Amino acid sequence: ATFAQALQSVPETQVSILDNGLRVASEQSSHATCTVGVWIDAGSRYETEKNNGAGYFLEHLAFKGTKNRPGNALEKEVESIGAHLNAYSTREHTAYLIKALSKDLPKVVELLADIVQNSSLEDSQIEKERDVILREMQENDASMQNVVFDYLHATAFQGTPLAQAVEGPSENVRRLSRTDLTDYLNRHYKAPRMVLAAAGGVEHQQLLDLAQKHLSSVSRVYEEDAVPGLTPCRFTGSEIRHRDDALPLAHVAIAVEGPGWANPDNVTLQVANAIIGHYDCTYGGGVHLSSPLASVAVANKLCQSFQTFNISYSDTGLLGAHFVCDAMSIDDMVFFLQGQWMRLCTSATESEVTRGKNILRNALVSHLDGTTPVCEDIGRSLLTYGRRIPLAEWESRIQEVDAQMLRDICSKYFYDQCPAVAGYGPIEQLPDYNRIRSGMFWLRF
Amino acid sequence: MLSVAARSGPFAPVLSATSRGVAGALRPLLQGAVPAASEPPVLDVKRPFLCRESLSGQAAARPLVATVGLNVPASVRF
Amino acid sequence: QPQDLEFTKLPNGLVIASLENYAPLSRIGLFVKAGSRYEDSNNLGTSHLLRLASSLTTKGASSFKITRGIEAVGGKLSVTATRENMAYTVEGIRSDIEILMEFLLNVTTAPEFRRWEVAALRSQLKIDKAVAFQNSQTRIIENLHDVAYKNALANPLYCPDYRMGKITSEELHYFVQNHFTSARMALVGLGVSHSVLKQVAEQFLNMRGGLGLAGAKAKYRGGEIREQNGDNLVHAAIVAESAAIGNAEANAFSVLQHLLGAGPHIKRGNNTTSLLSQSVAKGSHQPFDVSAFNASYSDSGLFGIYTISQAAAAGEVINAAYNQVKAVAQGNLSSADVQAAKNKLKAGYLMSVETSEGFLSEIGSQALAAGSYMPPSTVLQQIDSVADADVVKAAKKFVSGKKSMAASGNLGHTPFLDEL
Numbered sequence: 001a002t003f004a005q006a007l008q009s010v011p012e013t014q015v016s017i018l019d020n021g022l023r024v025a026s027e028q029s030s031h032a033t034c035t036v037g038v039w040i041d042a043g044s045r046y047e048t049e050k051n052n053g054a055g056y057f058l059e060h061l062a063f064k065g066t067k068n069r070p071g072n073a074l075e076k077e078v079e080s081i082g083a084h085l086n087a088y089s090t091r092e093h094t095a096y097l098i099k100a101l102s103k104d105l106p107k108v109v110e111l112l113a114d115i116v117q118n119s120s121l122e123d124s125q126i127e128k129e130r131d132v133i134l135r136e137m138q139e140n141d142a143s144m145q146n147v148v149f150d151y152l153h154a155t156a157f158q159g160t161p162l163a164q165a166v167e168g169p170s171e172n173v174r175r176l177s178r179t180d181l182t183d184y185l186n187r188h189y190k191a192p193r194m195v196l197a198a199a200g201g202v203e204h205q206q207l208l209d210l211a212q213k214h215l216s217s218v219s220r221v222y223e224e225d226a227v228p229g230l231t232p233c234r235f236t237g238s239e240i241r242h243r244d245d246a247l248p249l250a251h252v253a254i255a256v257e258g259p260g261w262a263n264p265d266n267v268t269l270q271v272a273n274a275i276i277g278h279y280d281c282t283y284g285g286g287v288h289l290s291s292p293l294a295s296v297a298v299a300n301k302l303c304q305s306f307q308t309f310n311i312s313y314s315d316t317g318l319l320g321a322h323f324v325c326d327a328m329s330i331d332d333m334v335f336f337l338q339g340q341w342m343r344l345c346t347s348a349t350e351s352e353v354t355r356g357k358n359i360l361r362n363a364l365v366s367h368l369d370g371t372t373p374v375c376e377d378i379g380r381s382l383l384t385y386g387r388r389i390p391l392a393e394w395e396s397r398i399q400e401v402d403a404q405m406l407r408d409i410c411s412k413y414f415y416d417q418c419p420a421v422a423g424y425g426p427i428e429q430l431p432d433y434n435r436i437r438s439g440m441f442w443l444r445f
Numbered sequence: 446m447l448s449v450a451a452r453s454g455p456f457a458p459v460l461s462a463t464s465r466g467v468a469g470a471l472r473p474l475l476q477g478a479v480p481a482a483s484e485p486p487v488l489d490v491k492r493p494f495l496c497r498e499s500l501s502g503q504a505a506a507r508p509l510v511a512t513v514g515l516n517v518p519a520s521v522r523f
Numbered sequence: 524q525p526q527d528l529e530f531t532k533l534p535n536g537l538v539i540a541s542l543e544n545y546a547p548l549s550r551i552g553l554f555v556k557a558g559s560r561y562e563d564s565n566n567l568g569t570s571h572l573l574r575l576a577s578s579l580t581t582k583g584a585s586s587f588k589i590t591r592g593i594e595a596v597g598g599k600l601s602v603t604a605t606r607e608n609m610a611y612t613v614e615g616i617r618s619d620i621e622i623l624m625e626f627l628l629n630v631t632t633a634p635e636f637r638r639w640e641v642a643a644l645r646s647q648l649k650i651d652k653a654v655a656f657q658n659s660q661t662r663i664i665e666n667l668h669d670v671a672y673k674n675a676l677a678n679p680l681y682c683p684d685y686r687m688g689k690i691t692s693e694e695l696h697y698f699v700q701n702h703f704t705s706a707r708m709a710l711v712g713l714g715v716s717h718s719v720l721k722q723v724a725e726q727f728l729n730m731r732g733g734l735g736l737a738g739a740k741a742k743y744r745g746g747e748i749r750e751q752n753g754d755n756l757v758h759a760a761i762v763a764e765s766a767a768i769g770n771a772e773a774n775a776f777s778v779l780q781h782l783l784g785a786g787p788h789i790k791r792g793n794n795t796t797s798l799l800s801q802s803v804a805k806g807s808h809q810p811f812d813v814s815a816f817n818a819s820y821s822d823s824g825l826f827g828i829y830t831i832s833q834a835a836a837a838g839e840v841i842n843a844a845y846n847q848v849k850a851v852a853q854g855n856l857s858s859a860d861v862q863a864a865k866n867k868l869k870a871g872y873l874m875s876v877e878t879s880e881g882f883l884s885e886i887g888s889q890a891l892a893a894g895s896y897m898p899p900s901t902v903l904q905q906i907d908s909v910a911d912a913d914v915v916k917a918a919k920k921f922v923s924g925k926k927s928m929a930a931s932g933n934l935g936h937t938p939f940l941d942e943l
Contacts, residue, residue, distance in 0.1 A: 003618050006547035009524070030525065032899070033873050063789050075795040079788040080863045082870025086790045101870060132791075135495045143492045200877075249489050282519035282654055284578045284647075288590040289516070304489065305518075324489060358597030362616060365548045370878040391547075486653050494756060494831075497810035498791040504814035504829035505760070506785045508605060509664045511655065511680050513574055515593055515600040521655050523664065 007395055013378055013388035014204045020220045021192035024211045025378050025388065026204040034105060034200035035371035036207075037097030038112050039379030041193035044091045044166045045313070046228065047184075052168030053133070054184040055094055057176055058119075059087045060129040062096065067118045078111060089166050091153075092313055093383055099372060102201030106210055112196070113214035116189060121178050133173050140167070145322065147242075148251040148422050155240040156255060156318060156420035160233035187228065190219040197378040200371035233316050237418025239433045243426075249304055250425030251324045254337070254436070256417045258310060258317025261384040266312060267360075267397045268409040269319055272344050273308040274356035274363070276321070276337075280305040290355060293340050302329045302336070314384075318420070319413060327426035334431060338439040344410040346445050353403045360398055365391070416441045528886070528896050529717050536706030537728050538890045541717045549620040549714030550879055552612040553631050554887035557702035559678050560606045560820075561738060566694045568648070568682025570609070573695055574602045575647055577611065579640050581629040586640070589626055598623050600630070603884070606668070606676060607820055608891055610884065617714060624719075628727040634699060636692040645687055652681045659758050659931055660829075666748045667760045667929035671825060675739035705731040709890035713883050741823045743925075747940055750931040757837040757932030760816060761845070761943075762827030763924035765917070768819045768892055774905060775913035776817055776826050779921075781864035782851065782914060783815035783828075785871070796863055799828065802847035803840050809833050813844050821892060826921050834933035845943055852918035861911045869903050 015025040042055060063085060065071045078085050083100035096115055100108045140146055150165050157163040167173075196215060198207050235257040259265050279294035287298045297303045306323035325333050368374055368391065381388040417440060423430050431439075450457045465473075494500045505523035513519045525544035532538055559570040577600060580586045593600055598615030600623075613627040656662055669677045682690070705728055712720045743764050766773035784797030794800035799813040811832045818825040828848060832840040875881045876899060889897055928940050 001543075001545055001617060003547055003616055006545060006617060009545055010547075031873075031877055033870070033877055060791060063792060072793055072795045075789060075792055079792075079796050080866065082788075082863075082866040082868075084788050084870075084874070085792070088790075099874060101873065132496050132498055136499060139492050139495050139499060142490060144489060247490075248487050277516075280518040282513065282647075282651055283517075284513055284515050284575060285590045285594075286578070286586075286643075286647075288578075288587045290591060290594040304487075326487065355595050355597070358595070358616075362548070362597035362599075362614070365616070366614065369548075369880075486650055488653060488657055491657060494810065497812065500756075500810050500812040500831060501787045501792065501794065502812070503660065504812050504816075504831055505660050505664055506780065506814050506816055506829070508818040508820070509661065509668075509680055510603060510605055511574070512601060512603045513577070513651070514602075515578055515590065517599060517601055519651055519654060521661055523660055 004392070004395070007392040010391050012390070015382065015388065016204075016208050018191070018211060018216060020216060020218055022194040022196065022211070022215060023382050024196045024208055025382055026198040026202045026207050027374055027378060028202060028204065029200050029371070031200040031371055032102055033099065033371055034102050034198060034202050035097060035099050035375040036105070036108050036112065036196070036198045036202070037095055037375050037379055038116050039195040039197060039383050040094040040116070040189060041092070041383050042094050042188035043089060044164055044168070045161045045230070046188055047161060047164065047168075049164065050172070051176065051180045051184055052164050052172045053176055054181060055089045056167050057129060057133060057173070058181055058184065059089050059094065060133060061121055061125060061181070062087060062115050062119055064125050064129070065120050065122060066114050067120045069114055070120065074111070074114065077107070081107070083108060091162060091166060093380065095376070095379060097372070097375065105202060105206065109207070109210040110214045116194070117218055119185070121181055123178060126178060130173060130176070133167070134170060137167055137170060137173070144247070144249070144251045144324070144424055148253050148322065148424050151240045151242065151422035151424065152253045152255055152318065152420055155238045155422060156235055157233050158236045158238065162233040162313065162316070186223065192220065195379050195382040197375045197382070199375035199378060230314055233313070235316065237420060239421035241421070241423040241427055241430065243428065244424070245426050245428075247425040249324050250327055250330055250423065250427050250430070251322065252330060252334070252427065252430060253320060253322040253422045254334070255309070255318040255320030255420050256413060258312055258319040259413070260315035260317055261312045262315065264397060265409050265413070266310060268401050268406055269310055269413065270360050271353065271356040271398070271401055271406060272410055273310055274359040275344060275348070275352050276308050276340050277359070278307040279303070293336055296336050297333070300332070302333045306337070320419070327429050330427065330429045331431050334436065335439065338436070341410070341414050341440070342442050342445070345407065345415040346442065348403045348407045348410070350403045353401070353406055357398050357401065361395065364394060414440070530896050531717065531721065532894065533724065535729060536733070537724060538709035538894060539717070539721055539724055540709065540886050540890050540896060541712040541715055541720050543716050544714060546714045546879070547616060548614070548879070549617050549712070550612065550614050550883055551620070551624060551627060551710070551712045551715065552610050552883050552887050553627060554608060554610050554709040554711065554891050555631070555703055556608050556707035556891055557698070558605055558607045558609055559680050560675050560741070561702055561736065562678050562698070563674075563739070566690075566698065567678060568686040569690055569694050569698050570604065571680065571682040572641065572644065572648055572690050573698060574604050574609065575644055575651060576634070576636070576641065576695065577602050577630055580635045580637055582633045582635050583629045584626060589630065592622060593626060596622060600627070604680065606678070606680060608888075610887055612880070612883070620715060621719070624723050628723060631703065632727055632731070634695070636695045638692045641690065641692050641695065645690065648682050649687050655681055659754065662750070663758050663760050663929050663931060666750065667762055667927065670746045670748050670929050671743060671762060671927040673742050673744045676741040676820060676823060701736045703731065704733055704735040705729070706734045709887055711883050711887045711890065713879055741820065743823070745925045745927045747928040748930075749934050749937070751934055752931055754932040755834070756831055757834050757930065757934060757937055759830045759837060759841055759930040759937060760827060760928070761841070762816060762825045762927045763921045765817070765824030765826035765920065766819065767824050768821050772913065772917060773819050773824060775909050775917045776819070776824065777868055778861065778864050778906075778909050779826070779851070779914045779917045780815040780817040781867040782856065782860060783848065784813065785815055785817070785867070796860065798851065798860070799844045799847050803843045806839060806843060807836060809836060811840050813840065826917070835936055837932070837934070837937045841938060842943070848918055849922055852915065852922040854915055856911065856914070858911060861914060865906060865909070868906055872902060873899065
């Protein structure tokens with residue numbers, strides 16, 4: 001019962017393609033429940049600064065009434081069977097997913113076929129959701145990490161569609177019309193950019209038959225033959241700082257340019273993140289934490305929390321660290337963080353690499369647990385890689401990483417690079433961009 | 446006898462609060478001092494709730510569950 | 524491949540449940556009947572410090588060794604506490620699960636409790652209580668239990684402010700020696716065989732005494748605490764006594780909860796089948812959120828209504844929800860709504876046991892409460908056995924029962940218990 005044959009024992013994701021070109025993928029388990037979702041390759045990266053809130057406003061409007069299920073009927077027979085309905089939008093993907101029982105598997109599928117295909121976008125509902133979205137952005141203004149990550153995207157991807165937020169600016173929310181939403185639907189809800197994913201108690205032939213019966217004969221043709229393309233986004237080494245001294249804590253994110261989805265170096269970079277790790281003030285480890293940054297943050301009482309991120313988009317991304325701390329510690333925190341990066345560029349040993357490999361293995365195997373994250377991973381995998389990468393392949397790519405190539409990849413993506421810095425709060429002691437840029441290399445090396 | 450000092454004998458300084466704007470010639474008995482009360486910890490502010498749509502789900506329905514971890518942030522479920 | 528859940532009660536009372544599903548990630552929990560309900564008024568907050576003391580020095584493994592070994596193998600250690608029981612869960616891959624097994628058993632059964640470590644850890648007690656009390660419904664649930672019970676369920680999950688700086692090591696030793704005994708523990712494993720789990724059970728879990736201390740039966744008082752703190756939103760909870768765990772009527776109460784609304788099913792939905800949301804939403808033009816609160820403990824129950832509303836319209840929201848439950852109690856309900864509530868309850872249970880953590884929590888709770896493993900099909904069968912007249916009886920028991928109220932916010936328009 002070793003780890004290798006245990007990862008071989010995971011069931012294979014079965015993928016088929018319909019006539020219109022939409023992918024249908026399923027993974028079967030012994031659970032009595034299931035998660036069935038639709039993943040669309042559409043987001044704020046596909047918007048041209050006149051419909052910047054379009055995908056957000058459509059996912060607000062998607063569950064409020066369709067042509068065959070007007071008004072609140074769709075609510076009534078999604079929750080008469082105890083199913084849960086969820087939707088989210090990133091900068092590159094959109095997901096509509098249902099958690100239900102296995103025996104309610106057909107109706108759920110046609111409910112999805114009722115949502116992404118025959119949505120009715122009523123004008124008074126448009127006004128109500130416009131007000132709802134305006135005050136929901138007002139709610140999101142007071143969450144400092146969302147503001148900091150939006151600032152980081154805006155200063156790292158300037159002049160590109162990757163800088164803008166998923167919600168868009170408030171003026172676009174005030175002036176989006178029904179015609180622009182229908183144009184967004186008819187441009188981006190195309191069959192070759194849709195994956196119907198299912199996980200749990202799902203029979204793949206039954207799912208394929210239901211997708212043939214319900215999801216066929218949709219889209220596949222641009223009506224004016226205006227095929228859109230995804231241009232590369234320029235990374236800009238820059239800094240944004242929003243100083244506001246009345247806030248109790250300060251949030252700072254520092255990132256560099258990532259390689260993208262298709263680059264295998266992400267795996268190595270993930271191990272690097274596992275060496276630095278994360279910390280929060282409620283952690284029980286204290287000073288004996290294996291991460292040197294977390295141990296020195298406990299010992300010197302520096303940060304409220306820190307975390308490392310590797311956000312990947314189509315051949316680009318942000319690889320870095322976010323920390324919240326009080327003002328008087330900020331610069332000192334930056335110093336220690338940069339030191340850890342240079343340690344990973346210069347003096348990475350095999351013990352911390354083995355620890356990071358074990359942490360990454362445990363992290364991905366623990367993340368793939370339950371029908372919802374498995375279906376979520378299937379949807380992202382067929383949208384990004386074009387295939388579902390098996391977990392044994394992930395284990396092989398982890399186990400091929402040693403200290404030498406970790407040093408090489410960390411030096412290629414970290415050493416002597418211009419970062420993107422976002423800061424919010426009492427950020428007076430946040431150092432200059434020149435000091436941070438000087439801290440991104442070592443004179444001793 | 447229509448006063449709290451004439452009708453409530455021992456409970457005169459607890460039903461009445463007497464401050465001095467300008468101090469008199471005689472010092473008051475029991476001067477008193479504040480022995481350096483501790484500072485509450487500084488926490489990041491939570492998002493508010495200004496629509497019904499984000500308030501939906503905030504009401505508790507299950508017993509309180511607390512969870513701590515070695516390298517996992519502490520959480521509470523309702 | 525998870526062929527059978529295999530179950531064994533040892534003669535010292537220790538329960539062992541294991542399931543070899545051949546999963547790549549083994550998860551092992553120890554469930555102890557040593558919650559916050561077993562403290563009296565002399566050692567309040569001891570269970571909170573015991574929950575935070577999972578990474579201290581043990582006689583067999585130091586704190587540095589425990590933290591470094593657990594993070595070196597990539598696994599994790601978690602403590603989950605309710606008012607009734609505590610659970611110590613360790614998580615790892617199969618090839619180094621056993622080092623985590625001595626770590627888990629050393630922490631749970633042989634603490635050293637050095638006084639300088641707990642003196643360093645009481646600041647963590649203060650920080651953890653502040654982080655937990657950052658949001659208002661935690662304090663509402665704490666105040667509601669303190670309202671509802673005289674003893675043995677009204678003890679707080681988090682340490683009181685005066686008890687910080689005063690919990691000593693011998694109090695923790697007394698609590699562990701009186702409550703972490705063999706007849707109140709269940710060792711549950713997912714991804715391990717029964718033989719390894721039973722041999723570490725006989726090699727570790729045989730040195731403890733017996734049934735330990737009894738308890739105090741959790742008698743009911745009722746009342747009201749109103750905490751004026753000037754929030755923009757008023758949080759109110761009105762609860763009454765209900766059935767305990769193991770009573771059939773409690774199942775009916777669960778159905779009644781899903782008759783009234785136990786949470787949304789659509790991200791940004793209107794809650795069309797929620798009776799409380801339908802009754803309140805027709806008279807409110809400003810944001811609100813109303814649900815049914817259900818809490819069943821091994822000797823007691825608490826069923827009620829949770830409301831979050833504006834300060835100026837708390838009274839009409841509370842009165843509309845209470846009138847909706849009163850209308851349910853007078854036999855005004857549809858059988859289709861009872862069937863939908865049953866479907867909601869069954870789907871919620873099957874989604875709760877979907878993950879491995881929820882599955883092992885369910886197995887440990889069942890082994891502690893009843894000493895046996897009940898299959899989910901039997902759980903759904905006894906859910907389907909509930910009559911609608913039982914739901915009417917549960918609503919009538921809530922209506923005719925003595926109420927308990929915990930409120931917070933700007934309570935200038937929040938009604939009192941006699942004003943309902």
